[PDB]
């Protein structure tokens, strides 16, 4: 109730609106689509969150520390495994393999009526994404809820390495 | 040889080989700090007061002790209302005299204070100092600040603990901290002081790039081409614009509603007024030294005083024969200059309807002016054949300087702050740096598009230069290079680019921000 | 973590891995309280002044303040962290009667519209 | 006559050949024609409008502004390399180092200002130096190149080092000796300061008997005020930040589960911020709950610490209410209807304040 009165009480310049005062005055997929939607949910406020409030810096420290340990254990882990097996827009790593083409299609952009934005779409669905049927996705899942399990940092990390 | 011709003349010709401005100060420096110091901070200005004003009456001056008295009365007359009639000789003044004013204060705004005092010495400061030094004495302490509600009176209402020294010696402490609500070292801490704040300075400069600055851009829409001159207000509030059809018109940089000093015309709800009465396009316009005057000089050949309180004209000035070109208030705004057509410049006083100086020697039209910052010199130069700057004298009017070198019409002139340095632009967009003393020609600046640049501006210590030209570009120039670690000039530090909008005129603030000025052509 | 929200936690979740990269670039920047002559230097770039522009005009959207950063008001890595994380990205704001916005014709719009007058038949 | 606004054309009549002769063109017209042609469009009245050109060297890539694709720089080779960089140039590639860019003096004082202010010596001549220190910084005319670098050591200085009360304090005047310098441009730093004053004056754990509750209070207070000036000054070149610190301060002292120090923090801040009218408008309504939620199960606690607590509480409260302005029984009257509307404690001392337009203002709000 507080909130709802306050959001009237200041003008675009930082100043009281005397009208409210004076007022106040007065006397395999469903699962997945519930978890987009969660994600999107929650997604949203985190970041409608920026032009709200403020957040103290009383726990910078430990993120920190916990990434810095992160990066440890994930470089400690390396140098094991390695050895056993032995256009402005900011597309990512995948544009130096399409950067010649990509500039030729900007060249001759009129005979593509694809937009910058769907043709970007375009390419990450048939970008690639690295005997035994089920093997292959089943393994995608896996690798991806063990990444979700990495997510929880602030409680994987005690038992993140080997005893 | 010029040197031989030179050297023949001068063989020819047997050459041989009071208190209270201290007071309105410190009131305007404890209303600047903290709430939670100014409870305390406050309690000087009774004591300070109260002794200038019996040194004042004991000196003689009684004139200025009862001048004192009437102004500064309105604020103590809700809480000294008996000692101040009194002050309309008795034991009271005996008393006061004897026994030295006591003030409780802490460690941290003692130290912040004289800090402060030192800062400002030879503007008011020492009078504060000595008055403090001989009729008070200042017991500090390493309490926390007292305030009605800090840590220090709680702990002292609740815990029921006994008043001090300090507490014990008309608003006492005594009332706030009781139930029923070290002395100081003066001259010798000031040298301790200033010991310490000498070790704090910079005196020196390698590597490194130029300053980092801002600007703020104020376009004008739908002049058509009808627009000859600009010109802010000392402190950004105003802005004047001369058109061709002999008409000002002054704005306000903020929206507020402007104000008039008529009562008709009371709480009248305008932001934007006029000043008509010039017969011709009007080609100058000089704000004051708040600004309540303006100059204003059109091709009609006259002068105008204007008025920023009830906007009408005051006075004419008809002393000269021709179109006039530029106008120019002085350094501080009592005195102010003219040239144009005629091949002469002029020194006026708003006090006379005639000048009081005429300035001959040039050959050709006049296209700059400026003052020295001490108010006694004047800078103005011509075009065509005789491209030559000047530099008159005001006292006798007889030129004492030459700068030749030249090429093109000058456009705008500008005079260093320490006064020591002078900047000349062209329509070939090349400035030049001169050194006044030795009358010779320090370096030239490159970069700028022909055209033109009608203004210049120089930084508040004189390190740095910015110029605004018509090729729609300001830019930022560095005076003096950093000393090496071991088509443009390499002492440009920045320089930006305007949306079709020739710049007219350009600022700097105090701080490393300026302002600008265009009328924007979607041509 | 009893007294807790889960807001709290989920803007945890989202921020962390940008408040941990600026605060070691930080600490890097300030070793032994001494100013490193190694590190690279604070520099303002247009990237990051665009991505604050972009944030503002998010913002915009749920009509909180009043803009002309749309360049439609003119026609004559994606940090997840508030904007005051990077003040080498923010941009002082202008007085909403003081912006430049242009109607489709392309006339400047007058916003003073208390003292305007109407001129008589 | 030559001001006409019709176009000018030239005829072409021959003499002969090699001899043409040129005449303007000129068409006898009817009074009509001309007496009843409709007027032309009235150009629209002169306004100005304003924007940024740069900010600290950058041009803004904003519509107003030119598009970068349409002489700026020199190209010489005694041009130095990091004017490109400072331009801020998206098709730079080298990144200058901080000994490209900041002369070896300016180091060199940083150095010295730094180790100065960070003496915890009790000696009076070490805090001699640290207050010439602090003057120095405040008042030094060339320091527009050591502002970010301020700025980040205060954020890091009061980051890393949450249990020292000595180096809070010293980072809290050094934001306020910053902000006083006339000299130098901070609105856009006005966030940047602001969020650590609000995690140091808005923390659960400061420092780590009395003097430790005196120095922590002390410190909470002094940044309250230093949060206040800094939001009555740059508020209007950042939009948002009135609001927002008034609304996490808010949020926050809305909370029984925080201790009392965090709650005095919040009703500081919110007061700080908000202004006189926030607080009217938004503490008083819940005073009355608030009262019986903590004061007295506060109020039963005994304990000569939980009693300053209580204390404290209590004043910070009739202060932020007193914020708004600073008989017969009709005054008696005023107390009892404020007792019955804030509360037994907070309306007992406003009643005891003896003020007739406090508890006017305070009333005001009752139908809310």
Redesign the interface.
Known sequence: R??E??NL??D???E?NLSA?ES????TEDARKELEQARIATEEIAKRSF????Y???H??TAMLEQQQLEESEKQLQAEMDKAGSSSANLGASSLTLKHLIARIDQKRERVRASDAELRSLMNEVRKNRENIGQEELYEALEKVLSELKAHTEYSTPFLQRV | NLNQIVTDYLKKKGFTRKYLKAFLLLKNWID?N???YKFELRKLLWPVFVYSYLELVSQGYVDDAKHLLETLRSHFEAVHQDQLALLDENHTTRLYRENKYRIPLN??LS??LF?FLE?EADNGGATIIYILQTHCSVETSAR?PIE????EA??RR?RNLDLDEADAHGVTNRDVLDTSARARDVVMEMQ??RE??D???????????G??????????????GTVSCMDFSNDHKL?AVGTMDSYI?V?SLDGKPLKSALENEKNLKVNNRKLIGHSGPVYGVSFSDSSKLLLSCSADGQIRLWSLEIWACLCIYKAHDGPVFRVLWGPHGHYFASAGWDKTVRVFTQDHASAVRIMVGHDTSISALAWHPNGTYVFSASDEMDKSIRMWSVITGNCVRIFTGHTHYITALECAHNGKILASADTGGNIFIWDIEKGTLIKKCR?H?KGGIPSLSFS??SNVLVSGGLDC??RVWDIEL?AD?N????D????????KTPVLKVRFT????IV?GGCYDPE | QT?EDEAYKIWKQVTKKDRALI?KE??Q??AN???????????????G??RF?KSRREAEALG??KT????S??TSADRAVP??YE??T??????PK???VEDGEG??I?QFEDMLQLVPP | GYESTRPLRYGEASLGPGQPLFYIDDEEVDFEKVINAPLPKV????????????????????????TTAE??????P???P??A??????NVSF?????????????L???????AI?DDDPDEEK???R??????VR????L??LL??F???I??Q???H?DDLFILRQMMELA?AVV?N????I???A??L???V??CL????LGKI?ST??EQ??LR??AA??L??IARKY??????????????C??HF?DP?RPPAVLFGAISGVAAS??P??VR??VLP?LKTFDSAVLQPLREKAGPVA??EY??LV??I??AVQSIVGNGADLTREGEQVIEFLGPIVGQRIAQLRNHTLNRSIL??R??
């Open positions: 507080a909130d009165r306050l009480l200041f675009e310049r930082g009281y005062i106040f005055k007065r006397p032009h709200t409030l403020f103290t810096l009383e910078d420290r | 600047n903290l709430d939670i460690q941290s130290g912040n800090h800062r926390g009605p509600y800090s840590f709680i702990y609740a301790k002081v310490n704040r070790r704090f300075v910079i005196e020196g400069r390698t590597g490194g790039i300053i980092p600055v801002s600007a703020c851009m104020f376009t004008f829409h739908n002049t058509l802005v018109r704005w970069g598009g508040a210590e570009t300001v950093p670690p088509q443009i000039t390499p440009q530090i920045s320089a930006f680019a305007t949306k105090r701080m490393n921000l600008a | 007294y605060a930080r600490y920047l300030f309280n001494k100013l490193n002559v190694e590190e690279p230097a604070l520099l303002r770039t247009k990237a002044m665009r522009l909180l303040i002309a950063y749309s360049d008001s003119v904007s005051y003040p080498q923010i941009i002082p704001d202008i007085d003081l912006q430049w006339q400047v007058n | 150009p629209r009245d002169m306004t100005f409008t304003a924007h940024w050109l740069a900010v600290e060297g950058v041009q803004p890539s904003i519509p107003q502004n030119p002489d700026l720089l020199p190209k010489g005694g041009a130095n990091a004017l960089a400072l331009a801020g140039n998206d990144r200058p180092s901080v000994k490209h860019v900041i002369s070896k003096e300016l180091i004082y940083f150095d010295k200002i730094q180790a960070l805090m001699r130096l207050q010439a220190a602090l003057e120095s008042s030094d005319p060339g527009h190149q970010p670098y700025v980040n050591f954020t890091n009061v980051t890393h949450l306020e006083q006339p000299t130098l441009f609105d856009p730093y966030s940047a602001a969020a650590p609000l995690t808005m923390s659960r754990k009395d509750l005196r209070y002390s207070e002094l005020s230093l206040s000036m508020g209007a070149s950042n939009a948002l930040l009135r609001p927002k610190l008034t609304r996490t808010l949020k809305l589960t908000g202004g009218e926030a408008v938004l819940n009693e300053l204390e404290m004043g910070g009739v202060k005001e709000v139908h809310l």
